[PDB]
Amino acid sequence: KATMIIEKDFKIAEIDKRIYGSFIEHLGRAVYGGIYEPGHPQADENGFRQDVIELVKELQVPIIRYPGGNFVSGYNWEDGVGPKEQRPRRLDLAWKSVETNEIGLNEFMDWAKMVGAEVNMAVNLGTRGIDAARNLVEYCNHPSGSYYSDLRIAHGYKEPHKIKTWCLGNAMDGPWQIGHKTAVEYGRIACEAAKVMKWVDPTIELVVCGSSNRNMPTFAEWEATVLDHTYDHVDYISLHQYYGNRDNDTANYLALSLEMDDFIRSVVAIADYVKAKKRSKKTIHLSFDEWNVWYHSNEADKLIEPWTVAPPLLEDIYNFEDALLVGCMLITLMKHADRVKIACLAQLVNVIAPIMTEKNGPAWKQTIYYPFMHASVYGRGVALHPVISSPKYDSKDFTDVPYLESIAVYNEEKEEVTIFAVNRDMEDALLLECDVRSFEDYRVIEHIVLEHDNVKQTNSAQSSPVVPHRNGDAQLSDRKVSATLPKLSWNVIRLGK
Amino acid sequence: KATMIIEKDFKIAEIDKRIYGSFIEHLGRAVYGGIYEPGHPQADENGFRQDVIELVKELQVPIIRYPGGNFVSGYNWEDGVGPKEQRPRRLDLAWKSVETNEIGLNEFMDWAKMVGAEVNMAVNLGTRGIDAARNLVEYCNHPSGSYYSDLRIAHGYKEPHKIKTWCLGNAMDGPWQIGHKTAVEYGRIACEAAKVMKWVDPTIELVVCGSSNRNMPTFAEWEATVLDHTYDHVDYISLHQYYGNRDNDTANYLALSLEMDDFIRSVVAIADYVKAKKRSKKTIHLSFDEWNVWYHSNEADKLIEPWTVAPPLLEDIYNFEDALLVGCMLITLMKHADRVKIACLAQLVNVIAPIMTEKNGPAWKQTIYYPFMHASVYGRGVALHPVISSPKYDSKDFTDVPYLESIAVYNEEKEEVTIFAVNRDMEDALLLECDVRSFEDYRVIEHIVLEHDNVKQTNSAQSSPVVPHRNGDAQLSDRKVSATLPKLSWNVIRLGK
Amino acid sequence: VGPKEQRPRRLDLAWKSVETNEIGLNEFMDWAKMVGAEVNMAVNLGTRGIDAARNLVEYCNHPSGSYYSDLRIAHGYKEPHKIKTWCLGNAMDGPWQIGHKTAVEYGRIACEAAKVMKWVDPTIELVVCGSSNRNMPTFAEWEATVLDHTYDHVDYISLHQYYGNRD
Numbered sequence A, B: 001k002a003t004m005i006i007e008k009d010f011k012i013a014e015i016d017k018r019i020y021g022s023f024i025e026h027l028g029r030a031v032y033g034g035i036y037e038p039g040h041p042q043a044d045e046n047g048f049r050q051d052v053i054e055l056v057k058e059l060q061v062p063i064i065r066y067p068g069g070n071f072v073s074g075y076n077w078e079d080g081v082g083p084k085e086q087r088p089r090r091l092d093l094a095w096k097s098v099e100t101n102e103i104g105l106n107e108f109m110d111w112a113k114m115v116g117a118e119v120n121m122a123v124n125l126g127t128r129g130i131d132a133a134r135n136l137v138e139y140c141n142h143p144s145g146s147y148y149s150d151l152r153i154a155h156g157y158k159e160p161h162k163i164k165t166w167c168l169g170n171a172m173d174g175p176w177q178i179g180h181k182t183a184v185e186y187g188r189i190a191c192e193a194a195k196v197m198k199w200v201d202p203t204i205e206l207v208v209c210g211s212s213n214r215n216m217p218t219f220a221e222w223e224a225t226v227l228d229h230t231y232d233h234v235d236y237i238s239l240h241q242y243y244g245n246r247d248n249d250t251a252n253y254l255a256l257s258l259e260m261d262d263f264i265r266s267v268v269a270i271a272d273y274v275k276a277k278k279r280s281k282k283t284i285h286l287s288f289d290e291w292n293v294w295y296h297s298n299e300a301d302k303l304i305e306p307w308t309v310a311p312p313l314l315e316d317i318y319n320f321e322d323a324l325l326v327g328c329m330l331i332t333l334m335k336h337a338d339r340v341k342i343a344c345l346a347q348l349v350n351v352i353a354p355i356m357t358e359k360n361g362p363a364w365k366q367t368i369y370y371p372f373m374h375a376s377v378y379g380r381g382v383a384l385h386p387v388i389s390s391p392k393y394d395s396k397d398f399t400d401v402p403y404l405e406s407i408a409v410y411n412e413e414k415e416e417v418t419i420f421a422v423n424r425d426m427e428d429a430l431l432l433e434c435d436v437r438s439f440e441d442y443r444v445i446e447h448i449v450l451e452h453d454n455v456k457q458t459n460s461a462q463s464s465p466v467v468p469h470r471n472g473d474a475q476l477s478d479r480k481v482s483a484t485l486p487k488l489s490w491n492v493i494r495l496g497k
Numbered sequence C: 001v002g003p004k005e006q007r008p009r010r011l012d013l014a015w016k017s018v019e020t021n022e023i024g025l026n027e028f029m030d031w032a033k034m035v036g037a038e039v040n041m042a043v044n045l046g047t048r049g050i051d052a053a054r055n056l057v058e059y060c061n062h063p064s065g066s067y068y069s070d071l072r073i074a075h076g077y078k079e080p081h082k083i084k085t086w087c088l089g090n091a092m093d094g095p096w097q098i099g100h101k102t103a104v105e106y107g108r109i110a111c112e113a114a115k116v117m118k119w120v121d122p123t124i125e126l127v128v129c130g131s132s133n134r135n136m137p138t139f140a141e142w143e144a145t146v147l148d149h150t151y152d153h154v155d156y157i158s159l160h161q162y163y164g165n166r167d
């Protein structure tokens, strides 16, 4: 048995819909053969895959980070704009590919508009710096009457793109990054970039790069230093996290969101430390601008030859347990709606992706597609504080892991309450009881469940054995939702009226 | 009108009783004329005033920091032990007084035993260092069989004092401190002291010094550096805060507890930053080991001549508004019961104190005595998460100041719920309604009120216009407590069964 | 040193033992004479420093005519021990050492100790401490910094290694 109190007045915060963002890099088949495939029978007039467009629209992704990622740290934005015959072929040193620049930022904006997403644009602070940062912002955002704004118009884009939210580089804390910088070097260049970008267009927001990963030897130290350098000029700091089940330990794998919860709290604490050191009245929030499962494809990648166009990199095929873990991360992001304002599922298409495509073939939904869709579609509203009493278990790296991972989100305007919940129990159902006196005249609309008996089962172009059903047994009597959560299930219990 | 949900399952944490601690320094008449006055009509056989002893027991202070404070940073502990004839007279540079050392550590422990309080002993890291630190821990804590343990025995204390919780110096971030140290310098010596101390006795816990003040130019930077140097060897970091109403603005003055809230949150975030930076599993908590109102006596102290014995320093005479703020500070401590585990009202007797004495005369209770007693006696148990909805106001330095400052503390063993509440409103009563559905069969026991028309009214040896009364109108009906909180009142609503 | 009655019992924090001090430096030299070995005497730079370092070199090596040399004589050792080779502390790069010091801190105090020691007796030679262990996170960095601080005043740097067959 597990209990929960769903009280309307115990609120975490309004959820920023941008926690349901995603990310496309110039990496592998994410662009070329992903969003864009001129050959394809389902391609539109500009070469965009309509099938992929529809699949992204159904996710309701409000914001997509572009164009990187490790890619941007060696990229010249001018190489992807203007007449295609003048666009150079470049060696992408990030992923050891030849980049044709057949797609550049203006074509990507056109695509984003098709899927109804705004673009979280990144500037190169690896091989480039402040001049290119300001010039890119002018090119994108200044209406007209200057060289770069008039350039965008000459390139066929009369109206400014008016990009709101920019990333100051990609994580350059690692020795594998193009133009790696120590935290003082980065904080200094980010500061000066942030300044000029904001002087070109003061309506923008800036995300400074956190650590590329929580295991980095400079983790936490990085963020503190970077923020100490940038605090007054920026709006968010980012964090990044990928998970994997490399030692076949399902119970331990599903517990990993407890680490994510702590990682978030840590980065929040750094921001609040620096806030206090500067005596600033401004609070800096988090952009969790890379998160996913990523591991399945590590060995296949090692054999890709350098200097191909659009190599099949990072193409993980997700299973059912991966979907439960993604569900637990989504609940974790919602749990921190007060401080996490942007997040990006890395990445959106082909590359560690909820959507996979085949050349001249179908686009299909991975297992992780479902819990992401559910969170994005039914998780707009106010994240409520979970007061859970749940049984617990110990695993290799965690103790007191709840079997129940859960949160409710109340949308006042639709008059709905959705309860997201994962049963981590590998053997037994969990009987959830939720106390909803705070909500008068509500009923159960439906109870959706994603469950499969085999945690390693994948989806594919030809069959999808791992798909939600609507036969969850949740019922509401005398101010209490009772619901059976099957073992290893993701559950979406929706309430209305 | 204000509301409040008193929900038993929404808990902050168990309250550590040491948040009701205090502090006595070799300062002013805190010791000589305070705890200790030979030939006072109420002096016991060791010279300790019995009236003072009863007043402290009534407060139920569990722990008392000693002997400093700024005094410890220039103090040799050996000067206050052994036969009085061999104890030298010293220039105390901290308070420009002659310290005869007629009281030292063994006599203080004798007094501490009388009031039922453990002692939070501080070691000098101003003029002294790691050798003195180990020798004092040995002298106090090691049974026998070494020079310093046998020395204690010989001085007449056969059993070890067995002091649990030590302070690694006093705050030395200030230019006014004896033996001021930079955060690096202090961090390194605190680190090496903590080590040899814990090697003498691994049962101890250590408090590293935070900033002497939130307004210090090195605030926050200090804590992060100090913790970077000491994390693995220490258990708590301290914070210090005093408040004053020098511009006669009551509305702003009562809101100062919102600042203490932010300060606690800041220091917690710094501890959690350094934890993450070190990848430690240990959480560091806070010792709020100086807090109080302090300002009334600033001008009188300027006229005191250097190099007297036991000059009448820091002898603030508190008023009623001062008690309301102290009440707000106490509620703020409870609100942070999850991370603030020790706290020390600075100071206990004569010196910025809830208890005042006169030579050969009476001992009396300042206004601030009452909210502290109420908080200590009735605030044992679990602090519950306040879910309040209060009207609010703006002052000089704060926005959206709740008229209602309140928290409930649940004592499951006594089956009681205590609601502490201040109404900061200077004109209007506040009608509090408390939802108490999760406490079935609970009744109002009593409603204590401390109120006075004149905020500037003080108590004195001769009369106490400012005392609690029990004419509060709190009543249970239909699972809800309704209570009228008068303008500018401290209220304790006690429920049970 | 001196009459056993006035020698105190101490908590040795290194090995968590009570050290009665029934043996100290003059008795050890007595034993060293029996086995025909000279003594490589180490000075405390953990809890102590340059004043103790000079006073111990004087006590051991200066003939007579000063407080510490006459004190040795009075303790019953008329001729100086004439110790040639001293250790400037013990390895303090470790978090487990009493009075751990960073390479800079150790370097600076070793430097000033080496000076006053050699001024008492220029015939001595000094060993500055290297890393307590090859696996220390500050290995090599430590030695370079320590030597940068002490090169001109010292003669040797130490190294320490233990082996085991635990697998």
Ligand SMILES: *[C@H]1O[C@@H](CO)[C@H](O)[C@H]1O
Binding pocket: A025, A068, A069, A070, A071, A170, A171, A240, A290, A346, A347
């Ligand atoms: C996070 O990992 C890769 C793929 O998502 C990006 O290049 C990066 O910064």
Ligand SMILES: *[C@H]1O[C@@H](CO)[C@H](O)[C@H]1O
Binding pocket: B025, B068, B069, B070, B071, B170, B171, B240, B290, B346, B347
């Ligand atoms: C805090 O303020 C004074 C008096 O309480 C002490 O000496 C100190 O460290």
